[PDB]
Every structure is written in C-alpha cells, then in structure tokens.
Design a protein around this ligand. Structure first.
Ligand SMILES: *[C@@H]1O[C@H](CO)[C@@H](O[C@@H]2O[C@H](CO)[C@@H](O[C@@H]3O[C@H](CO[C@H]4O[C@H](CO[C@H]5O[C@H](CO)[C@@H](O)[C@H](O)[C@@H]5O)[C@@H](O)[C@H](O[C@H]5O[C@H](CO)[C@@H](O)[C@H](O)[C@@H]5O)[C@@H]4O)[C@@H](O)[C@H](O[C@H]4O[C@H](CO)[C@@H](O)[C@H](O)[C@@H]4O[C@H]4O[C@H](CO)[C@@H](O)[C@H](O)[C@@H]4O)[C@@H]3O)[C@H](O)[C@H]2NC(C)=O)[C@H](O)[C@H]1NC(C)=O
Ligand SMILES: *[C@@H]1O[C@H](CO)[C@@H](O[C@@H]2O[C@H](CO)[C@@H](O[C@@H]3O[C@H](CO)[C@@H](O)[C@H](O)[C@@H]3O)[C@H](O)[C@H]2NC(C)=O)[C@H](O)[C@H]1NC(C)=O
Ligand SMILES: *[C@@H]1O[C@H](CO)[C@@H](O[C@@H]2O[C@H](CO)[C@@H](O)[C@H](O)[C@H]2NC(C)=O)[C@H](O)[C@H]1NC(C)=O
Ligand SMILES: *[C@@H]1O[C@H](CO)[C@@H](O)[C@H](O)[C@H]1NC(C)=O
Lengths: 52, 126, 110, 52
C-alpha cells in the first residue's frame, strides 16, 4: 500500500501444471529473503537468496 | 484548542469528480487515524475507509473500491479525497473524524472511537 | 454483511429509564467487544457517547450505561429529560479493518 | 493475510504470503522490567563467587 517498508511485492512468471505454458503471479516476500542481481543499476531485478 | 475544518458546499454533474478536504489544527496531525463518513439526508450515517497520515496507508470499505482515492499532506496538515464517477444518491453530507492512537505495536485501525468531528460538507448532484 | 439491526424509533416520557438495543452478526459484534454508540441532533455533527461496550468518555453526564450480552448490545438511560432529542446509532468493528453502523432510533419526548 | 497457493510443476503447491489486511505494525517481544532486573542482579551476586 506504499507504506509497508519490510515486505516487497515481487511479481514473477512461473510454470503452471502444463509445462508448455507460463503464467504471471505475485507474492509478498520478506526483505532478508531477497538479494539484488547486480547485472545493472536497476533495483528491480531481485532474486531469492538461496539461488546460488 | 482543536479544529477540523472542511470546504464549503458544492454542486456537481453526474460522472464528474469531487474533492473534499479536511484540515486538522491544534494537535499533532501525524499521530492519529482519520475515518470519514457520509450521510444521505433522512437515513443514517455510512462508514468509509480510513487513512494513516504518517505513511499514507489506505484501506477502503466494500462497494467503494476503485472510485475513491484518499491522500494526506503533512506540510499543510490536510487530508484530501478525490471521488470520481458520481451517481444520483451521492447528494449527502460528508464528515471527517479522528480515530485511535497510532501505537506502532498494535493494530488500532478499526477501533471505532471517534472523538472530534468536522462541520460537515454538503455535496449536491442533479 | 449489511447494517446492524436497529429498531425504528422509541418514545419516552420525561423522568423514566429506557433501554435501546442493537443485534447483529456473531463475527462482528459477538466476537469483538468494540461496540460504540453515537447520537445525532438534526443539523450538526454527531457526538460520541461511549467508547467500549461500557467505559465512559469525558465531558458526558454519569447517566448513560452500556451492556453487551452475546449478540446483543444495549444502552440504558435513566431519568430522561427533553434535552435528549436525538437519534441513536450503533457502531461496530467487523474484521478486516471495516466498521459497520446501524439504522437509527429516533427518540421522542413527552 | 493468507497462504496464497501458487501451483508449480505437475502437482507441486507452493504457499506464499498473499495480501495484508489492516495496517502495518512491527513484530515485538515483551519482557517484564523488574523481574528481568532482579533476576539479572541475582545472576550478578551468584557470579561474584568465582570472580573475587
Ligand atoms: C508490549 O509492550 C508494549 C509497551 O509499550 C505495549 O505497547 C503499548 O500498548 C498499549 C495498548 O494498551 C498502548 O497504550 C495506548 O497508549 C495511547 C497513548 O497514550 C499516550 O499518549 C496520550 C496522548 O497524549 C500525548 O500525545 C499528545 C499528542 O500531541 C501530546 O500533545 C500530549 O502532550 C501527550 O504527549 C496520553 O494521554 C497518554 O497518557 C495517559 O496514559 C498514561 C499512562 O502512563 C497516564 O499516566 C496518563 O495520566 C494518561 O492517562 C499516553 O501518554 C493511549 O491513548 C491509549 O489509550 C486509549 O486507548 C485505549 C484502547 O483503545 C482506551 O481504552 C483508552 O481509554 C484510551 O482511549 C483514548 O481513545 C482515543 C484515542 O485518541 C481518544 O478519544 C482519547 O485519547 C482516549 O483517551 C492506550 O492506552 C501503549 O501506547 C503502547 N506503548 C507504546 C510505546 O506505544 C504492547 O501493547 C505490548 N504488547 C502486547 C501486550 O502484546
Ligand atoms: C485477520 O485476517 C483474516 C484474514 O482471513 C481475517 O479473517 C476474515 O474476516 C472476515 C470478517 O469480515 C471474514 O468474512 C466473513 O466470513 C464469513 C464466513 O462464513 C461470512 O459469513 C461473513 O459474512 C464475512 O464475509 C473472513 O471469512 C475471514 N477469513 C477467513 C479465512 O475466515 C480476520 O478478520 C483479520 N483479523 C481482524 C482482527 O480483522
Ligand atoms: C551467493 O550469493 C550471496 C548473496 O549475494 C553471496 O553473499 C554475499 O557475498 C558478498 C561477497 O563475498 C558479500 O560481500 C556479502 O556480504 C554477502 N551477503 C549478502 C547478503 O550480499 C555469496 O557470496 C554467494 N556465493 C557463494 C555462497 O558461494
Ligand atoms: C514473464 O512471463 C510473461 C509471459 O510469459 C512475460 O510477458 C514477461 O516478460 C516475463 N518476465 C517478467 C520479468 O515478467
């Protein structure tokens, strides 16, 4: 709602029950779960912390 | 002491938008909730969703979602309402009121303790 | 989740007690004790009468009293005069940070 | 709010945080003050038996 300050929104795309098709979904992950992927200066390509 | 002043009466056309302001004076404005209500003449009052003037957080009631926006401004210390897509029964009287205390540790949003009120704003449509 | 069930109106002779009540849904009133009563004079802003089901505010005479029993909530006034020419409204928590009001009980003095 | 149910793969279900209803408040833990203070003082007086 613009004032949470501890949890981000983090929309992504994901595999549905058919592995051909993908769909657009969203969540609310906590802030220490998430690290930025530093391929650029954009603060919008976030990722989960366990992925490496 | 304490004041909650609003704008004057307005007349509008259907499908337009109306802005209602509520200015709070005499106390620390960013430390209390504000709930707004609407009264059609003849029947009872009707609740609308509250505003958190510290962080700008919004919650609205049902059968109002989408066509109401509520903002705040702490420099002038005034809460604003933009209501688009007017309909024929919206000729009513609008009040702003002070809610509970912003506690930072307990959810005091829907606490129905309204102590101070505004003078009322007449909105007419035809 | 409509408005709270409230009577149409009541009539009261001066100098006698009268009780007015609301009933509602157990998820709204029957679980949370956050029930308040407001009154309205014709023309001006409403004024608060009680915070909780029974816990007195300031600036009000020690005459009103509130009670809550399961679904029901009630306000009793004793030794009523002609200065209470107002109509009463319930106000209740409902969950999900929503507040549900009531219909209205017009009070007529004799 | 809730366990929003995202579906991944052939029948895997992943539970995430959905909306938030109500306002945002901080997660705290409360300890009594004077009980903590005199328990800490009792640990202090039992800790001077070793250090002179
Ligand atoms: C874990 O522990 C933490 C410990 O902190 C717990 O957090 C605490 O949780 C309780 C919940 O009960 C909170 O209590 C609430 O506090 C508010 C704030 O009260 C303070 O401010 C009042 C305002 O005055 C100041 O602010 C103005 C602003 O400009 C200044 O101008 C003034 O000069 C003041 O600076 C002030 O009046 C208060 O003083 C009162 O209380 C003290 C207590 O020590 C007395 O001595 C005083 O004499 C005086 O009585 C205080 O300084 C209270 O306002 C809340 O009470 C209202 O709400 C209740 C529930 O709704 C209701 O029953 C009360 O009757 C009261 O009702 C009020 O309702 C409306 C609100 O605007 C008004 O109509 C009106 O004001 C009316 O009075 C409530 O007591 C603690 O604040 C909170 N602690 C912190 C640090 O935030 C936490 O809960 C624990 N976790 C658990 C248990 O899970
Ligand atoms: C904390 O969040 C939960 C989120 O689920 C809130 O629970 C929800 O409360 C609402 C109250 O309006 C429930 O709606 C009611 O549902 C019943 C179902 O029979 C219906 O009969 C009513 O008319 C009304 O629609 C909602 O069901 C409930 N959610 C669940 C999953 O049960 C809860 O209220 C929040 N806490 C507070 C203090 O607000
Ligand atoms: C896997 O990714 C994590 C997350 O970025 C890496 O952890 C950071 O590593 C850098 C470089 O050493 C440190 O400066 C940071 O303090 C670390 N933490 C965070 C939260 O950024 C980690 O190095 C990566 N590689 C592994 C585990 O081999
Ligand atoms: C995710 O998938 C959708 C549809 O497959 C696509 O439009 C979008 O660009 C993808 N990437 C992101 C970051 O949303």
């Amino acid at each position: 709602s613009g004032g949470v300050e501890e949890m981000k929104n983090c929309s992504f795309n994901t595999t549905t029950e058919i592995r051909d098709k993908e769909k657009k979904e969203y969540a609310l992950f906590y802030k220490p779960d998430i690290v930025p992927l530093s391929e650029t200066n954009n603060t919008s390509e976030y990722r989960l912390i366990n992925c490496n | 002491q304490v004041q909650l002043v609003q704008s004057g009466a307005e007349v509008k056309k259907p499908g337009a938008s109306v802005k209602v302001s509520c200015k709070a004076s005499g106390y620390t404005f960013t430390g209390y909730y504000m709930h707004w209500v609407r009264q059609a003449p003849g029947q009872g009052l009707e609740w609308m969703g509250w505003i958190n003037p510290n962080s700008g957080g919004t919650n609205y009631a049902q059968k109002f979602q989408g066509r109401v926006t509520m903002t705040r401004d702490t420099s002038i210390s005034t809460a604003y309402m933009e209501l688009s897509r007017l309909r024929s029964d919206d000729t009513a009287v609008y009040y702003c009121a002070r809610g509970g205390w912003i506690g930072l540790y307990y959810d005091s949003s829907g606490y129905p303790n309204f102590d101070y009120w505004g003078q009322g704003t007449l909105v007419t449509v035809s | 989740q409509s408005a709270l069930t409230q009577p149409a109106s009541v009539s009261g002779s001066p100098g006698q007690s009268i009780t007015i009540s609301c009933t509602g849904t157990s998820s709204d009133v029957g679980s949370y004790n956050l029930v308040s009563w407001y009154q309205q004079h014709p023309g001006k802003a409403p004024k608060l009468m009680i915070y909780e089901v029974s816990k007195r505010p300031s600036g009000v005479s020690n005459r009103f009293s509130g009670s809550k029993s399961g679904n029901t909530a009630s306000l009793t006034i004793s030794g009523l005069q002609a200065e209470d020419e107002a109509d009463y409204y319930c106000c209740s928590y409902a969950g999900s940070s929503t507040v549900i009001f009531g219909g209205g009980t017009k009070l007529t003095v004799l | 709010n809730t366990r929003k149910s995202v579906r991944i793969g052939p029948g895997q279900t992943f539970y995430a945080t959905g909306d938030i209803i109500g306002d945002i408040k901080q997660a705290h833990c409360n300890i009594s003050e004077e009980k903590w203070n005199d328990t800490l003082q009792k640990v202090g007086i039992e800790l001077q038996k070793h250090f002179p």
